[PDB]
RNA sequence: AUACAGUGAAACUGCGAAGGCUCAUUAAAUCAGUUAUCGUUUAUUUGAUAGUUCCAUGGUAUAACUGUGGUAA
RNA sequence: GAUGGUAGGAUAGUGGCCUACCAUGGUUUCAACGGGUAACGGGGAAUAAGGGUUCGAUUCCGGAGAGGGAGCCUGAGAAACGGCUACCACAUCCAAGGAAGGCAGCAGGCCAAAUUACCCAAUCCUAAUUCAGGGAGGUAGUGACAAUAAAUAACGAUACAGGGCCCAUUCGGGUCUUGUAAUUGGAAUGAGUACAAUGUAAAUACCUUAACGAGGAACAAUUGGAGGGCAAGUCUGGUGCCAG
């Protein structure tokens, strides 16, 4: 027996006194056997406490098996041997055989997103993805201990990096080093030996706080005031959280009970139970609401809302993947996808989930629009809310499982969930001088991710740039942008020569999907038996199947983003891309200048993205060749995925031009099955492919015109007779549908077309009928544009007839 | 059973009485425990 | 004791357990003796009981064992 | 299928044991067939005991069952206490993906809830064996129903008293070595404490047995009954000092 320390029990005492989570990091081998003692201390600090405990691991438990019949018969045959007596258990065996432990792999961390735990035991340290960190430290509640065990390689990294700034020596990872430094900065975290000594490198001093909640008392006061009918029953069933959440539920109830249409959109963070408030308001809406409601979540992702709906219904008055069917006993509600229920929107109330903005504008038109805006884009959705609908949208961000937590602050700081849209420039007109200058500098990512204060403030600015209104990336993407071997960045922020300060005008992350460098990194990582870092090369290596692209290295754009001010920000992004093309063609400090004049031996430079209109316009100012796409509907936005790749190298122009030619040849046929998107964007894509072909080719891929007997075989003679019947008569479907496929094929092959005639050629390629495509695009002079299309068909038929026959 | 040692954790008034890279941990607990007090910045003159 | 050589965890092997409780009421049909089976089965016990040969040694395929692993088990 | 015949099937083989065909048989008042229990009782089923005369030794009540019927498998021997398949219910783990066995069992209880320890030494049984074993089997312990024979004293000396006992309604009568916290003396041993050896696989116990072990022999047996007597005491009654 020995007294341990004056700080490690007192930390749990004041952590449960202030209802704040706390972090222990244990080193050494005999470290599993001190989680009994920390769990006992966590319970005896306050009995009125959750008891469950997580054991997130990655591949294998430390010294046990988590199967109680298995270890029971193992200890039975241990009894039968006789090295251990009958009524004997060491405290770790007793801990795992009596406590309530939930076991998860590091891969399936998404299965425990909702429940609550008193303790979390992170077993392995060397692999810790930040999405898993954000999912476990969120579910640990206010009297909570998160413990993290270590390994001898991490002990070497600790003894190295605990002096000033040194690192470990062999893909190298710096996210775990940033983690170690953040835990050195945290006040509610410390590092303990396996013998319960203290390493005071992480929050050394800690006093026992004095023995003893106004916002909670104001919550109880306003709740009891609302109590003194079924509205108070719903309010008391909902308000398991802050008075902010209670006031939000009460205000949404008041504005959406009898007022039938308002557009209320409650916005909140990952805490505070937004889905809980929605599901707890669902029962009150079913009471004083219409017989049908419309939910717009993801399919089979409405766990908290459906649980709170069933819970509040059972509170008041009740009784291919999963069951989300509608039930009633004395009501209807369906969790549907995008608005195929346009004619099935007789429900007067629809509640949507967080951000698909055009699909949201499609679905939210003619009913009471409740909406849940999770932070986990928001500015543009609030702008679209104010641009149309008595919008009473208001919500707040007080936490649910705490009142405020330094563990939540350190988690947000390390995982970089904090953002700031302040300007902090020299001037906007002087940043327009940077847009004329097109000057860019490299990141120096090792010194960037080494956690120093001003470096971390600029890195938070860089993370706000790299995820500012992006395409819904995540913290694991931040860990890939930090700790991958094939990565670089560029911050083309300031042109000025002032003192310490600046901004971020444009971040752009490259990915060296190479041949030489990627082959070196892959042959390295095959010893570690993993690796997947070649996407843009491997897409074309199966779609177009070119040994030239198998031999040529490539840079691929992971992401690139600018400010959200104005079209000058897109000009700044274009200047950043042009500066990056010039950069490819022509401890440590947290920037680089001479290395911005340095590069590798890369052949191709490509950006892979979704088929967006402004992204296509950026790809055209980029003019990088609009290469082979994929029309499989990626269910996030339904957007098709195109990887536009320039060739900026010595001798690759014929290869890239032939690839663009093959993509152009495939796109006209693949616009029949699963590409029915637009007319102007389709013309822009065809023009981009032909522009790539004209820029790359000199006379190599120069196609010959429509030959005589081949053109005679492609049409029929009576088909051309019907074409002349359309020339001097009506252009009906008895002669304008059998030949229209060959007409559109030869028209997009090879002698000019108008805007209306180009939309007619694209309309016959998309094979829709007359009153659909032209009336959607031009919306003016329908029969006159049909006659202009017939005249262009007559000119094409007269040209083909007078050419061949 | 508080006031007693369920397992090893014997609870006194305020103190807790428990019982039971090698040289690296032993040295970092012997001398270099609070030696990293003024080792935070490493010339981080922000 | 430079193809085996004693201790021997865990594996194949020979055998071990070689005969233990409750519940609904069958009148020489349950039972006991006896006659017979050239009318029949039989490990073990015991006594007996085998006559065809044209122009120096026969084949891969599995363990135990190693090695790579999956699964809460 | 009742009774038999002929042939085949199946059998370890005999066999209406089963099937085709055929004949209309067969048992019975010389007790067919059917009726029940002190069929938790009986029949020799068996040992008998030197006086218990239907208590008094045992094999077997009938057949089943391993949650419930069904089907299959193994073996010299089986429709297996130890196997599999499917159906139906119980039922535990579970990370909800799946892996199972049977414990829906046996012991107990309704002011004696502890038997579940040691051995094959004996008798048999199996056994490759001059060896191994058997919860077959034996041994021991807690768990009183005052049922059973013993003890809690035996023998002397001295002193000092004069009264003790019995009958009877009464008066009274009859009788005689009888008493005493009196002193005192040396002998006896038993409960207990214990050497052992014997016994026994071993240990307990019985048996045999050296050493110590009594004066309040305090090494301290009860239970119930009959009757008094006492205070500067207390209470009640009322024709002093009394009665209760």
B3 touches chain A (CB under 8 A): no
| Among A263, A26, A248, A229, CA closest to A147 | A26
| Nucleotide lying nearest to A55, CA to C1' measure | D95
In three-state secondary structure terms, A110 is helix
Dihedral sign for Cα atoms in the order A660, A664, A665, A671: positive
Burial of A496 (0-12, 13-18, 19+ CB in 10 A): middle
A197 touches chain B (CB under 8 A): yes
Per-position DSSP letters for A298-337, written without gaps between them = -TT--HHHHHHHHHHHHHHS--------------EE----
| Nucleotide lying nearest to A66, CA to C1' measure | C72
| Nucleotide lying nearest to A70, CA to C1' measure | C73
Cα–Cα separations (whole angstroms), residue A297 to A290, A301, A431, A602: 20, 7, 41, 44
| Among A613, A510, A611, A628, CA closest to A570 | A613
**Would strands A441-442 and A490-491 be described as parallel, antiparallel, or unpaired?**
antiparallel
d(CA A804, CA A705): 11
Name the DSSP class of A208. P
Burial of A267 (0-12, 13-18, 19+ CB in 10 A): buried
Q: Measured over all CA atoms, what is the biggest interatomic distance in chain B, rounded to whole angstroms?
A: 53
Long-range contacts of A569-573 (CB under 8 A, 24+ apart): A569/A505, A570/A618, A571/A435, A572/A431, A572/A434, A572/A435, A572/A492, A572/A505, A572/A506, A573/A506, A573/A618
Within 8 A of B25 by CB-CB distance, chain A residues are 27-28, 155, 193-194
Q: Which position has the token pair 């072909």?
A: A693
Name the DSSP class of A39. H
Q: Provide the Cα torsion A702, A705, A708, A709; round to 10°.
A: 50
d(CA A90, CA A98): 12
Asked if B20 and A6 count as a contact pair (C-beta separation under 8 A), the reply is no
B19 touches chain A (CB under 8 A): yes
Contact A199 B29 (CB under 8 A): yes
Contact B21 A156 (CB under 8 A): yes
Cα–Cα separations (whole angstroms), residue A524 to A171, A513, A530, B36: 9, 15, 10, 36
Asked if A62 and A121 count as a contact pair (C-beta separation under 8 A), the reply is no
Of A27, A40, A453, which is closest to B44 when you measure between CB atoms? A453
Within 8 A of B38 by CB-CB distance, chain A residues are none
Q: Indicate yes or no: strand D within 7 A of the C-beta of A585.
A: no
| Among A522, A677, A690, A547, CA closest to A620 | A690
Contact A94 B20 (CB under 8 A): no
Residues of the binding site of A:
268-277, 400, 563-565, 570-576, 618
Contact A4 B46 (CB under 8 A): no
B31 touches chain A (CB under 8 A): no
In three-state secondary structure terms, A726 is helix
Contact B8 A158 (CB under 8 A): no
Q: Indicate yes or no: strand D within 7 A of the C-beta of A66.
A: yes
Give the minimum alpha-carbon distance from B1 to chain A in angstroms, rounded to a whole number. Answer: 11
Q: Which position has the token pair 């060397």?
A: A126
Contact A198 B33 (CB under 8 A): yes
Within 8 A of A2 by CB-CB distance, chain B residues are 17-19
For the CA of A29 and the C1' of D57, the distance in angstroms is: 74
Contact B36 A200 (CB under 8 A): yes
Name the DSSP class of A297. -
Contact A193 B29 (CB under 8 A): yes
d(CA A436, CA A457): 27
Q: Indicate yes or no: strand D within 7 A of the C-beta of A69.
A: yes
Cα–Cα separations (whole angstroms), residue A542 to A523, A647, A657: 21, 19, 18
Footprint of strand C on the protein (CB under 7 A): A 59, 65-67, 70, 103, 105, 529
Three-class HEC string of A623-656: CCECCCEECCCCCCCCCCEEEEEEECCCCCHHHH
d(CA B28, CA B37): 13
Residues of the binding site of A for ATP:
268-277, 400
Question: From its phi and psi, is residue A124 left (phi > 0), alpha (psi between -120 and 50) or beta?
Answer: beta
In three-state secondary structure terms, A118 is strand
Asked if A504 and A424 count as a contact pair (C-beta separation under 8 A), the reply is no
Distance of CA A255 to the CA centre of its chain: 32
| Among A132, A135, A127, A184, CA closest to A153 | A127
d(CA A378, CA A355): 8
Within 8 A of B6 by CB-CB distance, chain A residues are 40
Asked if A609 and A642 count as a contact pair (C-beta separation under 8 A), the reply is yes
d(CA A9, CA A18): 14
Give the minimum alpha-carbon distance from A451 to chain B in angstroms, rounded to a whole number. Answer: 9
Chain C nucleotides with an atom closer than 7 Å to a protein C-beta: 69-73
Structure-solving method = cryo-EM
Question: From its phi and psi, is residue A66 left (phi > 0), alpha (psi between -120 and 50) or beta?
Answer: left
Helix pair A243-256, A215-227: axis angle to 10 deg: 30
Resolution (A): 3.2
Question: Residues near A483 by Cβ (< 8 Å), separated by ≥ 6?
Answer: A171, A172, A173, A174, A175, A449
Of A37, A164, A198, which is closest to B42 when you measure between CB atoms? A164
Contact A44 B11 (CB under 8 A): yes
d(CA A96, CA A102): 11
d(CA A275, CA A303): 9
| Among A665, A638, A639, CA closest to A544 | A665
Within 8 A of A201 by CB-CB distance, chain B residues are 28, 33-34, 36, 39
Asked if A8 and A197 count as a contact pair (C-beta separation under 8 A), the reply is no
For the CA of A459 and the C1' of D231, the distance in angstroms is: 112
Give the minimum alpha-carbon distance from B21 to chain A in angstroms, rounded to a whole number. Answer: 6
In three-state secondary structure terms, A368 is strand
Q: Indicate yes or no: strand D within 7 A of the C-beta of A102.
A: yes
Buried b / exposed e over A218-247, threshold 16 CB at 10 Å, is ebeebbeeeeeeebebbbbbbbebbbbbbb
| Tokens of residue A112, six digits | 């425990």
B29 touches chain A (CB under 8 A): yes
Backbone angles phi and psi of A497, in degrees to 5: -120, 45
Burial of A151 (0-12, 13-18, 19+ CB in 10 A): middle
Best of A6, A164, A187 to disrupt the B interface (most B CBs within 10 Å) is: A164
């Amino acid at each position: 027996k020995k007294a341990i320390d004056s700080r490690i029990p007192s930390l749990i005492r004041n952590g449960v006194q202030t209802k704040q989570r706390s972090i222990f990091v244990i080193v050494g081998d005999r470290a599993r056997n001190q989680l009994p003692n920390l769990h006992y201390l966590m319970m005896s600090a306050d009995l009125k406490m959750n008891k469950s405990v997580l054991w997130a691991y990655k591949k294998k438990l430390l010294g046990f098996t988590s199967h109680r019949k298995k270890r029971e018969n193992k200890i039975k045959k241990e009894i039968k041997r006789g090295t251990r007596e009958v009524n004997e258990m060491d405290p770790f065996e007793s801990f795992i055989s009596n406590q309530n432990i939930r076991y998860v792999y590091y891969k399936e961390s998404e299965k425990i997103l909702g429940n609550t735990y008193g303790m979390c035991i992170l077993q392995d340290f060397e692999a810790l993805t930040p999405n898993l960190l954000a999912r476990t430290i969120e579910t640990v509640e206010g009297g909570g201990i998160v413990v993290i065990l270590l390994k001898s390689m991490s002990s070497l990294k600790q003894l190295y990096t605990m002096t000033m700034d040194v690192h470990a020596r062999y893909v190298v990872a710096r996210f775990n080093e940033r983690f170690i430094l953040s835990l050195g900065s945290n006040p509610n975290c410390l590092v303990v030996d396996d013998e319960l000594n203290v390493l005071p490198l992480s929050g050394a001093k800690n006093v026992k706080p004095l023995p003893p909640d106004e916002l909670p008392p104001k919550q109880l006061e306003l709740q009891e005031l609302k109590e003194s009918d079924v509205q108070p029953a719903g309010s008391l069933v909902s308000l398991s959280k802050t008075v902010n959440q209670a006031h939000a539920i009460l205000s949404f109830i008041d504005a959406i009970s009898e007022k039938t249409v308002a557009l209320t959109a409650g916005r909140g963070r990952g805490k505070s139970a937004a889905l809980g408030i929605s599901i707890a308001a669902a029962v009150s809406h079913g009471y004083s609401n219409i017989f049908v409601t419309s939910p717009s979540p993801e399919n089979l992702k409405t766990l908290f809302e459906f649980i709170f709906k069933g819970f509040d219904a059972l509170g008041y008055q009740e009784h291919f993947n999963k069951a989300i069917v509608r039930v009633d006993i004395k009501q209807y509600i369906v969790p549907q996808d995008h608005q195929v229920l346009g004619q099935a929107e007789l429900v007067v109330i629809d509640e949507a989930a967080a951000i698909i903005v055009k699909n949201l504008l499609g679905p939210y038109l003619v009913f009471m629009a409740s909406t849940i805006n999770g932070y986990e884009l928001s500015l543009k959705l609030i702008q679209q809310l104010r641009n149309q609908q008595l919008r009473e949208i208001s919500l707040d961000e007080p936490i649910r499982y705490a009142p405020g937590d330094p563990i939540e602050k350190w988690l947000n700081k390390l995982l970089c969930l904090d953002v700031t849209l302040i300007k902090n420039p020299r001037f906007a007109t002087r940043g327009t001088p940077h847009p004329s200058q097109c000057n860019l500098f490299v990141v120096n990512r090792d010194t960037l991710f080494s956690y120093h204060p001003v470096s971390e403030n600029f890195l938070e600015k860089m993370m706000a740039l790299y995820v500012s209104s992006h395409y819904k990336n995540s913290p694991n993407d931040l860990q890939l942008m930090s700790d991958a071997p094939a990565h670089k960045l560029f911050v083309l922020l300031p042109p000025i020569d002032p003192k310490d300060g600046g901004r971020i005008p444009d971040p752009l992350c490259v990915i060296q999907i190479a041949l030489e460098g990627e082959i070196s990194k892959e042959s390295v990582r095959n010893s570690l038996s993993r690796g997947q870092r070649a996407g843009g090369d491997l897409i074309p290596w199966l779609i177009s199947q070119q040994f030239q692209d198998e031999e040529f290295a490539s840079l691929s754009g992971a992401r690139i983003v600018r400010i959200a001010t104005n079209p000058e920000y897109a000009s700044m992004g274009y200047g950043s891309r042009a500066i990056e093309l010039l950069r490819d063609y022509f401890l440590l400090l947290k920037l680089s200048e001479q290395p911005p004049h340095y590069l590798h031996y890369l052949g191709v430079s490509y950006g892979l993205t979704q088929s967006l209109h402004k992204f296509w316009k950026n790809n055209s100012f980029v003019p990088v060749y609009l290469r082979q796409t994929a029309n499989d509907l990626t269910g996030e936005h339904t957007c098709v995925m195109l990887n536009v790749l320039e060739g900026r190298e010595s001798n690759w122009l014929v290869e890239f031009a032939k690839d663009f030619r093959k993509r152009f040849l495939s796109l006209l046929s693949y616009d029949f099955h699963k590409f029915t998107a637009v007319q102007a964007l389709s013309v822009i894509e065809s023009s981009k492919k032909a522009q790539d072909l004209s820029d790359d080719e000199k006379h190599d891929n120069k196609e010959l015109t429509r030959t005589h007997l081949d053109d005679i075989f492609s049409p029929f003679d009576l088909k051309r007779l019907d074409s002349y019947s359309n020339n001097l008569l009506d252009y009906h479907v008895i002669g304008d549908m059998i030949p229209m496929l060959a007409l559109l094929y030869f028209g997009d092959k090879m002698s000019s077309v108008q805007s209306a005639i180009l939309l007619a050629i694209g309309l016959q390629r998309k094979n829709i009928d007359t009153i659909a495509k032209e009336l959607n695009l031009p919306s003016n002079q329908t029969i006159a544009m049909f006659a202009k299309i017939m005249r262009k068909m007559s000119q094409y038929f007269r040209q083909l007839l007078s050419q061949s026959i | 059973a508080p006031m007693s040692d369920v397992g090893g954790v014997l609870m006194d008034k305020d103190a807790v009485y428990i019982d039971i890279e090698r040289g690296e941990g032993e040295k970092l607990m012997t001398g270099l425990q609070s030696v990293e007090q003024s080792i935070a910045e490493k010339f981080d003159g922000v």
